[PDB]
Amino acid sequence: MLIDPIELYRYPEKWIKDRDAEKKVRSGLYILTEDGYLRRGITTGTTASAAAVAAIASLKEKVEKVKVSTPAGVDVEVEVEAEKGFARVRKFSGDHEFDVTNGIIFEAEVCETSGIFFGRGVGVKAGEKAVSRSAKLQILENFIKASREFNFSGGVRISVPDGEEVAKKTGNEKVGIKGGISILGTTGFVEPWCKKLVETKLKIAMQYHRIAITTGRKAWLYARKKFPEYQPFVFGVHIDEALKHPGEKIIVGFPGLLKIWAGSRDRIEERAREEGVRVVVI
């Protein structure tokens, strides 16, 4: 059968009409639908990794594409514009109905001092650069691989030219992050949130009697561990749609997104017993 390499669900065998269907699915970049494909994007973390890897590789040859590892374990090929220690990579969000940082440019420059550094456009919170754990480990991982492959001993500074601006419309400034955007990504890929995806994933979830409706990757991991007999799915704030599923449903998510779906921290548990479905707030 054909299993999504990231979310791990199975695709209806009747949707697979293409000998190329598995290559796309196995790449983490495509979500097969009833009639076509949905394109996944790459996170700021993966785009940053690509920039760093391309900058190092470009020292000993012309680069136009690089392969980077991701937290999900699926290596992805990214198109870049690199030359002599300098790289420019644009993030793409696939079919996400609207990702504020889609198309944002990431620049990477090789420097003398060994290590990974973050410059302009990257926000700062509590005196530290706003790079999530996942993103940080991913970037370091690719940095190590590249340093060895290209016998590199220096370092790279990753920057976002329009980061400070784009940030002004990302609201993350009310979270303590100032002066730029955050670099993140739990899986390395951007889930293409739109109506088509919400409907497609519900249909995919129809192949399972018991399903865990989660808000994000962390929630999904929690459900995988605490509710193994439920097929874990990420529906974000689109819980109402997932609730149309006719089998056994369980809701797992963090306070932030659950109140957004519910309407308030108090409406969660109310909506819970009001739908006949347990809501696990982690």
| Cα gap 126→153, rounded to integer Å | 30
CA distance 167 to 177: 9
Q: Which two tokens stand for residue 277?
A: 């479905």
Q: Which method resolved this structure? A: X-ray
Residues 6+ apart with CB under 8 A from 41: 91, 92, 93, 94, 96, 99, 102, 189, 190, 192
Task: Give the amino acid at 86.
Answer: F
The Cα–Cα gap between 216 and 74 comes to 18
Helix 44-57 and helix 133-149, axial crossing angle in degrees, nearest 10 = 20
Taken in order 55, 60, 66, 71, is the CA torsion positive or negative? Answer: negative
Q: For this experimental structure, what is the resolution in angstroms?
A: 1.9
Beta partners for residue 252, in sequence order: 214, 280
Q: Output the DSSP codes for the chain.
A: --B-TTT-PBPPTTT---SSHHHHHHTTSEEEETTEEEE-EE-HHHHHHHHHHHHHHGGGS-EEEEEE--TTS--EEEEEEEETTEEEEE---TT-S--TTTT-EEEEEEESS-EEEE-TEE-EETTEE-B-HHHHHHHHHHHHHHHHHTT--SEEEEE-TTHHHHHHTT-GGGGT-BSEE-B--SSSEE---SHHHHHHHHHHGGG-SEEEEESSHHHHHHHHHH-TTSEEEE-TT-HHHHTT-SSEEEEEE-HHHHHHHHSSHHHHHHHHHTTT-EEEE-
46 Cβ contact partners less than 8 Å away, ≥ 6 residues apart: 68, 70, 76, 78, 138, 185, 188, 189
What type of residue sits at position 19?
R
> What CA–CA distances, in Å, run from 48 to 27, 45, 108?
19, 5, 8
Token pair for residue 137? 């480990």
Beta-ladder partners of 250: 212, 278
Tell me the β-bridge partners of 111: 155
What are the tokens at 4?
Answer: 């999504």
* Dist CA 231 CA 195 (whole Å): 21
> CA–CA distance from 150 to each of 51, 64, 78, 85 (Å)?
15, 16, 18, 12
Q: Provide Rg for the chain, Cα atoms.
A: 20
Nearest 5 degrees, angle CA 8-CA 11-CA 14?
Answer: 170
Q: Please tell me the distance from the alpha carbon of residue 202 to that of residue 193, in angstroms, as a whole number.
A: 13
Domains of the chain (ranges, CATH numbers)? 1-39 (3.30.1990.10), 40-192 (3.30.2110.10), 193-282 (3.40.50.10720)
